[PDB]
Amino acid sequence: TARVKRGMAEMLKGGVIMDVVTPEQARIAEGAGAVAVMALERVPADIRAQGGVSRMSDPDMIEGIIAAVTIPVMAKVRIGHFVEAQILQTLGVDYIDESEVLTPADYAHHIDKWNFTVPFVCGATNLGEALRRISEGAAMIRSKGEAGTGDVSNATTHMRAIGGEIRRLTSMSEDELFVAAKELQAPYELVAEVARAGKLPVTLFTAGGIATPADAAMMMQLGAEGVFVGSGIFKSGAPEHRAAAIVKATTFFDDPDVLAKVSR
Amino acid sequence: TARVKRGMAEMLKGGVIMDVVTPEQARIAEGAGAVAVMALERVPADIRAQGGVSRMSDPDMIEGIIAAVTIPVMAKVRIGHFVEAQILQTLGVDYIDESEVLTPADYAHHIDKWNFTVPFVCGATNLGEALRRISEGAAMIRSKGEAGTGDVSNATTHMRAIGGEIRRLTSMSEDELFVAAKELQAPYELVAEVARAGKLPVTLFTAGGIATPADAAMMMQLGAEGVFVGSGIFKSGAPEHRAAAIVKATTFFDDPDVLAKVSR
Amino acid sequence: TARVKRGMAEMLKGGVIMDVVTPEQARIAEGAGAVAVMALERVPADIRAQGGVSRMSDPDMIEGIIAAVTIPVMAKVRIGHFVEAQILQTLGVDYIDESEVLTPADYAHHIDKWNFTVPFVCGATNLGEALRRISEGAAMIRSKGEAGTGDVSNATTHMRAIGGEIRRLTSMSEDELFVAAKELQAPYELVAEVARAGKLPVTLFTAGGIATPADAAMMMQLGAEGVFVGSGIFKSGAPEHRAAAIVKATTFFDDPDVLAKVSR
Amino acid sequence: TARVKRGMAEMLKGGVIMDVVTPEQARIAEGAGAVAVMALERVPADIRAQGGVSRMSDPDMIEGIIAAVTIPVMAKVRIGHFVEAQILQTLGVDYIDESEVLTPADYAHHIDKWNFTVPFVCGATNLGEALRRISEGAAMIRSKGEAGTGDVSNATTHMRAIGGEIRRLTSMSEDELFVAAKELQAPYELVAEVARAGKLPVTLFTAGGIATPADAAMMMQLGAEGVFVGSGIFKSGAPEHRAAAIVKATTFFDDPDVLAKVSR
Amino acid sequence: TARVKRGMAEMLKGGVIMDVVTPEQARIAEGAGAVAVMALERVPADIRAQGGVSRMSDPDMIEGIIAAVTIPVMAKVRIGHFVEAQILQTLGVDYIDESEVLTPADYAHHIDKWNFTVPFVCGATNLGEALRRISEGAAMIRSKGEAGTGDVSNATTHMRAIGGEIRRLTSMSEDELFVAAKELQAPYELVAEVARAGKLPVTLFTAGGIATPADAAMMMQLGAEGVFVGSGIFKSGAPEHRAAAIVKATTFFDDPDVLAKVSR
Amino acid sequence: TARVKRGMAEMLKGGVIMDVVTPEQARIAEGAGAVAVMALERVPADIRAQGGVSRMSDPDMIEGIIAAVTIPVMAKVRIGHFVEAQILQTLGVDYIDESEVLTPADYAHHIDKWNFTVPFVCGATNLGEALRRISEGAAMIRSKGEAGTGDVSNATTHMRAIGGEIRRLTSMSEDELFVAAKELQAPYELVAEVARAGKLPVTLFTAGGIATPADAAMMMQLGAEGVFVGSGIFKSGAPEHRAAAIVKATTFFDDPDVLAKVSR
Lengths: 264, 264, 264, 264, 264, 264
Known about the structure:
By secondary structure, chain A is an alpha/beta fold. Chain A is built from twelve helices and eight strands.
């Protein structure tokens, strides 16, 4: 077996991770039944319009979130910014998200995630990319979707791309898997393990553009093991109600009466 | 004999389906002699005008329309958004429109409409596209026209393209129908059936850009079995009159005296 | 339940079909354990070297072969030459091969094989092509390989293309099969049946460029259900022995000690 | 033994050089533990936003900075402006930065830095460029990064380019170093010395787009021997504290608990 | 550690492998001090001019070579021809060469060499290709050079390419090895092992275009662990003398007096 | 002061070097007043005419020439063939010509000529190329001209290009010499030295296409310090006369009366 950071997100499966910019938002998230919160200073929707350089959040801000909840807290670093990660790891965040939402710090190389104890979430749009993040030590993959737009279509494409390629490897003649690893630009040892197992070596969540309960449930029905949702869930008026509806739609994704009720 | 959801819109034939954003618009529609209404929260003229993501309407908004009228009520979902459709089916709408007017949720795949009891309406611009929608389970086909523009010319092109290709199949040498299905990118079984019957396997209506009584009757004379019209009708000032004019034009499409009178 | 000429080559499965140009060859083929013979006047390697138009063989020549053997006799027609096929059918050939080795008679359209009682074999290089031949009534598919060169590599390609795409359909998400049929340019009903069954709807044999016992056994191990071989078998040395060696290799395709002995 | 101005920045190694626009900034820089200050009239972020030609600063302004601090003072000249450099040298600056932040005065040729006593710093984005600056007499190389944007990613690129090519030369087969010098467009004698020593011939610092303590420490961990930082340090809040935090981060670049505390 | 067929060619290191087409050539090879012979029916020089399809040799011919010597005997299969390999393995050859000299049988896929007990030699022109052959189970790599031309220049390029990339990985920053594996289109686990070890995971020989003692010794001085030479060594008049000279030049490759003596 | 193998051909200056394929040609050459001979087994006119690979000559053939004359003997190796050079050095040739007339053994790298005691001659067509050869250890530079054609015009272009660029450096502003070395792709130290001395760092001779006495004296008047001529001289009929004419033309290159007489 290939070297993979396995089983590091079991408690998050079936759950929603919510972006939160205040300890008040964090408590609303936890009371709604979120499995984790993502601490950030500035939103993907405001990053998308305002546009400075976006970096790791202030450690005081992230501590203020940690102090407010008992569920796990994640926070973001810029791609390739292994010192921002060294800092986050000493704060005691439960996960680091090496995130394309922030301004990349390295255009070529991601963080060598084997240099850390803390588990990392990384983004992917296709199975090759997911496997390259996992080869570098990622303990969870999420789709990139399109961050801060509310448009679920890119997340649909990512989840169908990753899941469609896993399915194609499972039924593939074994002698063609070497060329498949070359075409995926992924390590053969992980390609062969996905062909045998029919699963990504780590848990796969959806992120990017999930706006409604119907969206979240659709991403679950496409193979997602859990979902990330943005702070718009707070910015829109009955925040307890909206957060709770997405949690229930993720848990009971296959029940259309539930989805109708929580969508009202 | 190929698999098609046949005969699911017999009561709509010869009629007008009107978009409605309020129970009052719904009552005016039904008073004017509409055969069904299409519930939606914001219109194709405001979608084209504002943008942002357009999704399935709030289920309470739709239920308000169902409570206001006796005639069938339709509502829209995003292309490929099978969970928006799961939700609508439990609401008890009579038809679901898998609609290119909303923001697509899946840029590659449409909903597998065989997984539903409720019938779907899908758009097409040519016969190959109509047949692929039917192959997926569509129960009615409409033209896409150009939504919310009041320009009927796209709808004319769609109706002539679909009708023109049906005609071409009817007189085609039978041995050439295999290559015709390949050039149409459509299932041979449905191509062969169109070639024998001279008809689309399900009802064909016109939508997109129907502004006047003359537009509506022209689409009927080009082979439409009914028409969809936008809420433009209610934006116009004496809405009971505009709505009733379009209904009479569609019933009496072959009578130039009636068409002159209702355009006055 | 799709329309297909099923189960018309049960007696040939596992066997070798040999091209024969004289009644004496046909006798050697049959005493060597061939399952059928392909009667032809001029060989694919002769057509490939010399110019000229290549057509259906003289009916007297084909009748000379029918009278010489008890096993089934096949013979070729040009693609799209439905009258060549009407003539062969009345001769009482067991199969007609609509063959790209001859000069095509119709560059656009194949024979509508539903107009015949006699079964057809057609060539394919990929699954979409195979399914379009079956949709026209073919009762058996063979690879095109590269005929009369003795280079098995094109056959390897075709066999891997066809079997690789069948495998990909079997694990594909059901809702993606409609787009898959559009990309394969094949009828959905045949595509969905391949996805459910894991097999082509009719028997699949290899042809083209099979020169040695190792080639024949390699094609069986790639999923071929039988092989066609050229009259080169006759053209060299002790023909009884070379033909028996290919029949044995195809029968015992998984036994390397048998394959080593017959390769001497 | 190649001709190089070696060992002219021994006292700056490990330290931070801060841009200063007034004697008060220069005092805060020095009390914060900066190793040197870069005297300039108008900042890289001001040059980047407003138009105009940017030249050597007024000698009175530079003299005001020299009189205010005990640590070394550097100041800038336009590329190729050897007379700007003659003037600065007589002012008694400790270093002259031949800087791509100013408007170049010669688009083809850099200053022949051998004509001067005072040492020069020059920018580089890759090892070949660094070696060509050293060949012209530069006593120190810094990355160009992307000046006045706060985005560290260009600096990451330059630091990885330079250090990656030094590493590649150290393990290269000796007989290939002649072609390597031709591909780098650098003098062979300097290339061969880099291959033998594993180090650039002069001190290498990072500059451009370093905004936070994490950035500064990341550049040291990529091999920088010191960092330049912009006057943004002053521009925000408690300047004594922000400047001390960068000096501490650069000093203790490998200590994540120190880096976490100074990031608050 | 990655899965590699290690240590399977220890007795060949420092040695020459000679192509032989007769048991007489085989005995001359062995008496000259060859470590192994390569049994073939037809020469790369005659394949290059004559040009039929080139396949596995007759098993009788290969047995006749095995019977003639005590040193190991190798023989060739076409690329991707895993049945020709199944046959060779039962003959008891000591190595199979999956060879580009023969007509490939599969344009896309090589043999899955893990399906065999017998070790395989495969060709490579660069480190990525070598690692992909080893990932598939190869137990030895040789350069491709340019077969049957007597021109050593392509072998020079291959050996400098493979050896130059191994050197570049050894000094590379560890965090850049993930991207290096992507650029090499090679499994990360083998790229990381070459970076750590500074050696290919299996032995590396030169082949292709070695004509003289000076050529052989040059390929050894470029990192080759042994050499393959073609049957031209026999076709040129004092075959005992020529074969012996190449053996000595390979063994004593670093002694120019030896190389002068054996070149006379 | 840059590293160059200086002063190694002082005894050849003012002279002619003649290609010889036999001890008899060597004696005629030396009788005619040649300053050295170039031993080779087959000529540039027969290489151009036949092709196949051209290598270092048989060491016995070379030793035969060394035994036949008192004057220095050169011999050729393939570009990059450092082991052919190792062999020649032990033979005791006075110079090795790393020659583009033979088939290159390395298409990227030339021999590292510093690893030898024996001096090398290398070809150039421009000053940048001459300097790179010298950087590698060449002790003499010749033009490539166009070998074995009898057309002097390539040699004229080479001599004018090398001499013209030396002249251009001599009067160039010193600050522009850095960019000149970059545009020449040559080491700054050797460029600077040429700019100060107005001379190539080692002797420059002309070769390639010198057919008549007038050609030889023209190349001397273009700055050649000596000439190489092909064995064409001996192919001509009264070889003692043709050889002596070219020698006298090269000694007396500035005397039109002598040039007229020896051309008669």
